[PDB]
Paper text:
We report here the 1.95 Å resolution crystal structure of holo-ScNsrR, the first for an Fe–S cluster-bound form of any Rrf2 superfamily regulator. ScNsrR crystallized as a dimer spanning a distance of about 80 Å, with monomers being related by a crystallographic twofold axis. Nevertheless, the polypeptide chain was resolved for 137 of its 148 amino acid residues and forms two loosely interacting domains (residues 1–85 and 86–144, see Methods section). Another similarity to other Rrf2 superfamily members is the highly hydrophobic nature of the ScNsrR dimerization interface, which buries a surface of about 2,050 Å2 per monomer. Unique to the holo-ScNsrR structure is the presence of a [4Fe–4S] cluster that is ligated by three cysteine residues (Cys93, Cys99 and Cys105) from one monomer and Asp8 from the other. The latter forms a salt bridge with Arg12 from the same α1 helix, which also interacts with the carbonyl oxygen of Val36 of the DNA-binding helix-turn-helix (HTH) motif. At the opposite side of the cluster Cys93 is exposed to solvent. The more buried Cys99 and Cys105 Sγ atoms are hydrogen-bonded to the main chain N atoms of Leu101 and Arg108, respectively. Otherwise, the cluster environment is mainly hydrophobic, without H-bonds to the inorganic S atoms of the cluster. Holo-ScNsrR appears to be the first structurally characterized protein with a [4Fe–4S] cluster that is asymmetrically bound by ligands from two different subunits as indicated by our examination of all the other [4Fe–4S] cluster-containing protein structures found in the Protein Data Bank18.
The most widespread dedicated NO sensor regulator in bacteria is NsrR, a member of the Rrf2 superfamily of homodimeric transcriptional regulators. NsrR proteins from Bacillus subtilis (Bs) and Streptomyces coelicolor (Sc) have been shown to bind a [4Fe–4S] cluster, which functions as the NO sensing module. In ScNsrR, reaction with NO was shown to result in loss of the iron–sulfur (Fe–S) cluster and formation of iron-nitrosyl species. This process led to loss of high affinity DNA-binding and activation of genes that were previously repressed by [4Fe–4S] (holo-)ScNsrR, including those encoding Hmp-type NO detoxifying enzymes.
Author numbering:
A (entry chain A), B (entry chain A): 2 to 58, 65 to 144
């Protein structure tokens, strides 16, 4: 499962990607209302996207924002989280001699590689882009 | 992220896969001690694996248990959970016109397909199988 935070960050970028140059740099508020979350959640997401350099401005998508891959974004946004936790409160005795762990690393790489060919631009092509714009009508 | 329950079910199968024919059908207890969890957690996992038909017996791996793919097991064990929740407490307005959702479906399929070539047999090949047996020494 992907984090709510990761998905929401992606939603926010999608919303910023449909801004027709010379429409308006959106406020965080407008973004949060349109993508259907509270302000506070959207606020976190935007500040992170600013940390990453994919947004700036009033808010805008950067040169970088348009061209980065969705794979890269998810990798960055997922941050620390791993596919499995081999040492939580009760750490696993197979740690370090685990063939399953290796397989899950390969599987998780397959996941990100399926997303490397896409950009946010590709995600706001139709039908999605129109619906976002539709939601600001 | 994979569920603790899914990983633990896989741990339990791995433990059952190293039983040298005519060693001993393990009790749930022995499995839970060896894979490093409480009895109650292991108990759930085993009953599910019995529902799926990959274990039986005193506990044993079935004919089916040896040959099923790790991909199939994870798909079954993950059950209901989806890659993203497009309708939780605050459902997403992009539902049904979301290019991101489609991409994440492709990504998640890439994840399982990386695991389709493996079986539990492949996971308890070395170094893992020896360590499990080592943990019953
Ligand atoms: S069984 Fe393997 S992947 Fe699962 S927690 Fe243990 S070391 Fe990690
Ligand atoms: S942005 Fe797309 S994938 Fe994310 S919750 Fe909304 S419909 Fe689902
Ligand atoms: Cl490893
Ligand atoms: Cl869909």
């Amino acid at each position: 499962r992907l984090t709510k935070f990761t998905d929401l960050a992606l939603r926010s970028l999608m919303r910023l990607a449909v801004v027709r140059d010379g429409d308006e740099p959106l406020a965080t508020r407008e973004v949060a209302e349109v993508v259907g979350v509270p302000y506070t959640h959207a606020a976190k997401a935007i500040t992170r996207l600013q940390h990453l350099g994919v947004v700036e401005a009033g808010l805008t998508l950067t040169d970088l924002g348009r061209r980065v891959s969705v794979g890269w974004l998810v990798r960055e946004l997922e941050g620390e989280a791993e596919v499995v936790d081999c040492e939580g409160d009760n750490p696993c005795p197979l740690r370090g001699a685990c063939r399953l762990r290796r397989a899950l690393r390969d599987a998780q790489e397959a996941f990100y590689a399926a997303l490397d060919p896409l950009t946010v631009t590709d995600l706001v092509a139709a039908p999605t882009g129109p619906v976002l714009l539709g939601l600001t009508d």
